[PDB]
Amino acid sequence: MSKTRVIYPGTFDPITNGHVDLVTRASRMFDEVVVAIAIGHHKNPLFSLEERVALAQSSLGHLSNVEFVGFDGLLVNFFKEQKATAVLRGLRAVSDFEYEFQLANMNRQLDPHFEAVFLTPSEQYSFISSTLIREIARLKGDVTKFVPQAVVEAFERKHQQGW
Amino acid sequence: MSKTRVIYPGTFDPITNGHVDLVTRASRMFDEVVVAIAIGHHKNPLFSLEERVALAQSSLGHLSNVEFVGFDGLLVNFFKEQKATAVLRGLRAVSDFEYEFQLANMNRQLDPHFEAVFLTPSEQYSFISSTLIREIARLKGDVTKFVPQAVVEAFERKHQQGW
Amino acid sequence: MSKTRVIYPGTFDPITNGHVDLVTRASRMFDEVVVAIAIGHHKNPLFSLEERVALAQSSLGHLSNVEFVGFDGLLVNFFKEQKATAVLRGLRAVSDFEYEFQLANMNRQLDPHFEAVFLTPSEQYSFISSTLIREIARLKGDVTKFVPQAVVEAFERKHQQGW
């Protein structure tokens, strides 16, 4: 038991109940979980990095071994800085599987200690992605069933500001 | 004998011979078929909502039980307002199947009376999508084999206007 | 014993080691291989057409039966002008297979002598796409493992110019 530290990277724009479920599950299996929020300058996110970090901390801060860090460059550099055991990614559908399989092979060529582990969503969260939730919210749809309360309120603020 | 009403939602940008075949098929099986054209403000369409509705009406007017309606894009609310039996989608490829499977599960959680039924294209239309036809037409390709006459003429007008 | 001429079309933005491996393999099997670089005005490329042609020449010019040509408009027209035997595409993953199956069917309806042949990548190149390489390079990642030397140097030039 060298002690395990797993990185869960994403743009979390915004965090959803799918992300909550995977972090919770991962937190039971590894000693440390780092929610790693990519700044994502290109494909420019709806919520600022600061807001996305705040939402994540609010939604998952009850788990004592979960840390929240914003990061900018490449996953493989971050993995090495963080001395991580593995990266964790959720797999929803075949398009996620093919993309992640490719990226894991790329990151392994860049760093032979890279490792990627995957979880599949619990059946009730299986369609939830941030992209879908943004689409619904932009059409003034109710996203209350799919995201934490702080995220509903952040969308309210976005609507008050024109979006 | 309960009356069935099925919604066929899309951006129809423009309507193609693929959409004509699915609507025709659906019209034979359900009492009422609503071609429901999402305004789609974001991912902004080539043709205006009014032009897309005109193209659809002119291409499907020979079917007596088809209605043509623009809507905002929020499908589950539209389904309820329309008192529909089901939403109809065409499935061309595995990417369509995965996405529609997910959205059907999402819409069912938002409304437990939601229903989605699917058709696959007839083999001669199986590669046709609006997206592909726009791309061909933009490169000054002949799309006459793939779309109704009114659409060919609409593309001509687009080219005369610089596109 | 007829001469074969195969077109390998793409945006090559930039050319990668994946493309190099497919062209090398194709050059052993066909008499003439035409690296055909679509100008691609829409989805506007990082590298100019002239730079993309020069990179491809630099990376593959050691194979004496490979030609390098820019084109605009439709692939099927270019195929006819070039009196080609077939178009060659690489298939990396299921999403490539679906898209190329569709386009082959569509191009055959536009020209019944169209033909498309496919190769799968060698296992060490199987994740590499121009889109991935651009993403990594934009985040200041090292792409040296995945692209020819000429492309690494073209990215250097891009960084010196602000990108």
TrEMBL record, chains A, B, C:
Amino acids binding L-ascorbate 1: T11, F12, H19, R92
Annotated ranges, domain Cytidyltransferase-like: 7-135
CC terms in the record's Gene Ontology section: cytoplasm
Leader sequence residues: none
Binding site for ATP: T11, F12, H19, G90, L91, R92, E100, Y125, S126, F127, I128, S129, S130, T131
Catalysed reactions listed for this entry: (R)-4'-phosphopantetheine + ATP + H(+) = 3'-dephospho-CoA + diphosphate
An annotated Gene Ontology molecular function: pantetheine-phosphate adenylyltransferase activity
Site (Transition state stabilizer): H19
Top-level taxonomic group: Bacteria
Binding site for L-ascorbate 2: N17, T144, V147
Keywords for the protein's UniProt record, in alphabetical order: ATP-binding, Coenzyme A biosynthesis, Cytoplasm, Magnesium, Nucleotide-binding, Nucleotidyltransferase, Transferase
Residues that hold substrate according to the record: T11, K43, L75, R89
Swiss-Prot/TrEMBL cofactor(s): Mg(2+)
Compartments in which it is found: Cytoplasm
Main location: cytoplasm
Quaternary state and interactors: Homohexamer.
Function: Reversibly transfers an adenylyl group from ATP to 4'-phosphopantetheine, yielding dephospho-CoA (dPCoA) and pyrophosphate.
NCBIfam families for this protein: coaD_prev_kdtB (TIGR01510), cyt_tran_rel (TIGR00125)
PANTHER family for this protein: PHOSPHOPANTETHEINE ADENYLYLTRANSFERASE (PTHR21342:SF1)
Protein name: Phosphopantetheine adenylyltransferase
Organism: Acinetobacter baumannii
